[PDB]
Each structure stands twice: as structure tokens, then as C-alpha cells.
Amino acid sequence: DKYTALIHDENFSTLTLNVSRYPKSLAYWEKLLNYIVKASAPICKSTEPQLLKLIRCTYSSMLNEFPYLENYYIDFALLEYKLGNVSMSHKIFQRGLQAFNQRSLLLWTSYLKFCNNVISHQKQLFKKYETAEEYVGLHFFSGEFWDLYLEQISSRCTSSKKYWNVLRKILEIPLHSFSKFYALWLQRIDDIMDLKQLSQLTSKDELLKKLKIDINYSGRKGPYLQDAKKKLKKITKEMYMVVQYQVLEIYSIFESKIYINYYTSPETLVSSDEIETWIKYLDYTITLQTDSLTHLNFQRALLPLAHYDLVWIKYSKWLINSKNDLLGAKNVLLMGLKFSLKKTEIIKLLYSVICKLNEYVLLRNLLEKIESSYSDNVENVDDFEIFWDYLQFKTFCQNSLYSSRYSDSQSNGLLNKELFDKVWKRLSCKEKKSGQEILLNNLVQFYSKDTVEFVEKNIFQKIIEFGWEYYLQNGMFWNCYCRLIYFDTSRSYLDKRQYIVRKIWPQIDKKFAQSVLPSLTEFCESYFPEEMDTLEEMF
């Protein structure tokens, strides 16, 4: 049969194994799919169910890897529709609309187009359009959406009330094509043959008050109605003034600069000017203070570049401050963890959002998740920002868990059997791992008796005994080992300076001096001008 003839082919094995080896390419997915479709080409109900199960699972498994592909949710829906079950088509349209958080123009337009044919019960059908309207209605290109909706009223509705009702709303929206709908409005004003039909525009009171025209007027009506059409066309000309201004600004500044409105792939790069125009377009949209159009223009901006973390951070910021919604910001950063490749800034800002939200079990859980990613070695990671952001928020947790061991009530932040072994394992790698001194500088921050003794003996002493060359040639090491003794509150000045000079300094080897002197002079120049000479005589 055709199925087994497809399995034993070499191209299926090669294309498949490429996909499973390289998941995020999307080039191998689309070849695997385009091939398995073409093998099935008489795709109608006759073809055997094993093959349909494979091709279907191939679509559904591809759309999970790339949650933004509009033409593929559409295409898989159409496959299910040609195959003869519309319920599966509905469901996976719902799935695509849910992947975009209910705002994508193409899935709503291509969805409702499908919905016109397969759904009776006019009321529900219109509820689909009212649901689409409150989401994607204000999209700059959404006019063609409205062209559907108006097209569906005039065919369905005998009353014509709802057509005036909706078209009146379309007049106030700064779409890309506003003029198309202004022509329909002006024409429908032109076709009004009676005073009674002017109540369709607005009610009886606002016409007699604002424009001072009466529907009940009794007399020679014709010239009065001709005056009324002029008085009605003037204000529509004014609405045309405002909305034209807005559209021409939005196009002339932003929308004209945006050349790519679609997702492409995780391997796509976008131009810098396009980034800049998305940023400024989002600031402008925020300034308009229209929440629907604001979330829309974030989700609109999000699919062109989803993988940077750039628009994710901002879209968490405007929602954490302007709207003052902290949970919504957490949820934005969580959905940003999936698409964004860099993930470091999002996970730092996410640690902060979770801290302020006062969910500690969720943050500590997520630290367990990120340490489980590396197989419980975060200390061996190449990229330092992950280990550092992990280590300081981990510290903030174990301060709360375990009561402080040390006198003066100082919590033990970075000195603990769990974390100090992590730090020391990070330090034992020396030149190979990047962080180094940054991790060391924060070991000087304790400022007490017990902890200056602890950090004195357990690192700065052992590191001398093992005698590693990288840490001894370094001036930051000796500078920090001076600043650790020098800021102690237990020591007086005499034993402090005498301890630094009589012990700390002579432990430096004279061959290291050339590297050690510049950084260790900066400590002595500021704090110890008196003993500056005995420093120079040593080296």
C-alpha cells in the first residue's frame, strides 16, 4: 500500500532523522511535512487512516514547536475540512487563536470566513464577530475584517439598523483604509429618501439639538431634507478630518517603516531600523492609552520578533507600571521564557517580579528547575549571569529558611555549607571559568568579627596554601583581601594597618609585583598614604 511504501523510502528516514536531530530549524520540519503531504496527494477520505494519523500528528507536533505560524494553523484546518470533519477544524482554529492570546488578524479573518459557511444560527455567528471585534477590531489593517462583518449584516439582516450601528463605529477607527468605509457612509447618506430614515443615524433628540433638524417636520419636506443631508455631511467631513489626521500620522511615521509583519522563524534576524520603529510604535501606542489597541500592538509587534526578549521585557514593564498589574507581568515573562532565546534578562526581571508578588514557593521552585537544567551544577556553567542571578536569589531564600548562625545577628548570606561549597567549586576552576573576581568581591561584604575570621581562614588563607598562580598574580584578590581586614569593625586602627602591612603584604611574591602593584596601590594610595613608602620599597 501507499503507507508502507512511504515508510520504506529513504527520503522519509533521512528527512525525519534530520527533524529529530534539529528541532528548531523549521526548514527540516517544512520539508518533512511538504514531502509526507505529497506522498498522500489523493488526500480525500479514501486514503488509509495510518497515513492520515501520521500527517496529522506531524502538523500538530510542528505547531507546538512554533506556536506562531498563522498559515499553518489555517492550512491544517483546511486539511481537516477537506477530510470531512469540521469539528476538528473549529478546535484547531481555537488552538491557533489561543496561541496568539486571541489577537491575530489573519486567524480571525480566515477563521470567520470559514465560520460563515459551516455555522447557521445567525445569533451565534454574530457572537463570533463581536468576540473578534473587541480583540482585533482596532488593528490598523483590520478594515478587511470589517468588510466581512458589514458584508454579513447586509446579507443576514432585514432591519438595516445594525449596518448603520456598526459602520458608525468604523468611521471613528484609524484604519489603513478608512476612506472605503467613508464612501459607504456618504453613499448611504445620499440614498436616504425620507426624514424618518435619519433616525437610523442618531436618535431624534440629538438631531433636533445639535444639528437642529426635526424628523416630525410637516410641510414641503424636500428642500428641508436636502439641507439636512448637507448638515449631516459636514460633521462626517469633520470626523474625516480627525481620522485622516491620525491615519496619515501613523502611516507616515511608523507603519511605512515596517517591512515585515510576519513571524518567519527562530533563525530569522530583523533589521535595526525595524526594531527601532517597533519600539517607538509601541511607545506611541502606549501614549494613546487604548488598552485593546495597546495589547494588540504588543502582540502585533511580538510575532515579527518573538525571540529577542526585547519586546517581552517592555510588554512586562508597561503592564507592571502603567496599568499597575503585577500578575499580568509575571505571566508575560513566563510566556516570554518560551519564545526568547537569551532568557537571562527575562529570568532576572522574573525573579524580581516573583519576589515583589510575594510568591516564595514559586521562585524557589523555579530555582530548583533551573538548577535541575544543568544537572545540579550551576557552578560549572559557561555563562556567568545565570549562575550569579541564580546564586543571589538562592541566597535570599536560604537566609529566610535557616536562622542566622553568627553573632551580631548578621544572616549568613553567602557563607553556608550548601552555597559556600558552590562558590568554592566555582573558584577552583581559575582561568577556565569567567566570573571569578565578581564572585570574590561579594565575599568581602560581611564586616564583622566572626565572618572576617571565617572568610579569612576558609578562602583567603586556603587559596594561599594551595598557592594558585592566577589568584596570586591578580591585584583584585590582594586588594579585596586588604579591604576585608580594613573594614572590620572589631579591629582597631593599629592592629588593622599593622596586620595588613606585617602579614598580608609580605605574602606577595616579588615577581607578581608588576601586576599586583597597580591595583594594590589604589588601596594604599587612598586609605594608607602614610605607609605608601614601605609599599614601594617592597616591589
Binding site: 460563515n116 459557511n117 455555522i119 447557521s120 444560527h121 445567525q122 446579507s155
Partner: protein, 50 residues
């Protein structure tokens, strides 16, 4: 309509637009499988001839 598989061009084909789909009403009659005239006709009895 989009395709319009027809002899007519696009303007004539879009002129023939049908009314919207018929709304669904639940059947008030007997399903075709259940449709039958009255069975178990009593034959002409010896009691009838009586």
C-alpha cells in the same frame, strides 16, 4: 464567491449570490427509518364473517 466554477466571469458569478445558510430546526416528524404505514393489520376474521 471566490472560486465560482462556472461558465460566467467573476462579475456575473458574484451576482448569483445565494441566501445565507438555512438555520437548523429539529425534526418534528418520524425518521425515515422509522417510517411505515400501520402494521399488524387484522385480517378478515371468522369473527368478522360472523
Amino acid at each position: 464567491m471566490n472560486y465560482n466554477l462556472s461558465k460566467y466571469p467573476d462579475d456575473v458569478s458574484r451576482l448569483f449570490k445565494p441566501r445565507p445558510p438555512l438555520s437548523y430546526k429539529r425534526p418534528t416528524d418520524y425518521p425515515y427509518a422509522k417510517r411505515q404505514t400501520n402494521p399488524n393489520i387484522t385480517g378478515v376474521a371468522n369473527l368478522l364473517s360472523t
